[PDB]
Amino acid sequence: HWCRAPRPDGRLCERQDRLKCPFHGKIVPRDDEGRPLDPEDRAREQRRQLQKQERPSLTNLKAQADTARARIGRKVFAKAAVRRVVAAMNRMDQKKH
Amino acid sequence: FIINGSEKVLIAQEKMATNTVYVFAKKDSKYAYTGECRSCLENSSRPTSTIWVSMLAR
Ligand SMILES: [Zn+2]
């Protein structure tokens, strides 16, 4: 099976995904023109398209942390995460021994 | 020996070899692997000095 989703470039999606295509969500069977064979699936996609159409001065201490690179560092550098890093490594140390 | 009219025998005591490099490990410790060497002059000039090289657990 193929996603066969209608891309903005006019070509059907050729991604080979078992269940879900990341750029188009769930994968449903489609014909040569990229139309879902199930009429219910066509209606659901139309509803999704309608929903999409409907849709001091200096950075404070909290505002400075509000970004991408800080968020990933906070998750990586955590008391529970570091302990889980050690705890996971302890279990392979038992396997190594 | 005969100490105060009593026959006494000294019993051999087992000890780790000196001046030899040992690598041990403790399953529950902050050191993953520890290297040990109980160094001592061939002529026993002084009590043996133990040096430890270790490896902190991540
Ligand atoms: Zn796709």
Amino acid in the structure at residue A67:
T
Contact residues, chain A, for B57 at CB < 8 Å = 86, 89, 93
User: If you count residue pairs, one on A and one on B, with CB atoms under 8 Å apart, how many are there?
Assistant: 11
Closest residue by Cα to residue B50 from B33, B34, B29 = B34
Q: Which residues surround ligand 1, an ion (CB under 5 A)?
A: A 3, 5, 13, 15, 21, 24
d(CA A37, CA A31): 7
Query: Is the Cβ pair A86, B27 closer than 8 Å?
Result: no
CA atoms lying within 13 Å on the CB side of residue B55? 10
Alpha carbon distance, N-terminus to C-terminus of chain B: 55
Q: Is A68 marked as a binding-site residue?
A: no
| Cα–Cα separations (whole angstroms), residue B39 to B13, B16, B23 | 19, 11, 14
Cβ atoms A15, A27 nearer than 8 A: no
CB atoms within 10 A of CB A85: 13
Q: Is A50 marked as a binding-site residue?
A: no
Q: By CB neighbour count within 10 A (0-12 exposed, 13-18 middle, 19+ buried), where does A35 fall?
A: middle
Cβ atoms A2, A12 nearer than 8 A: yes
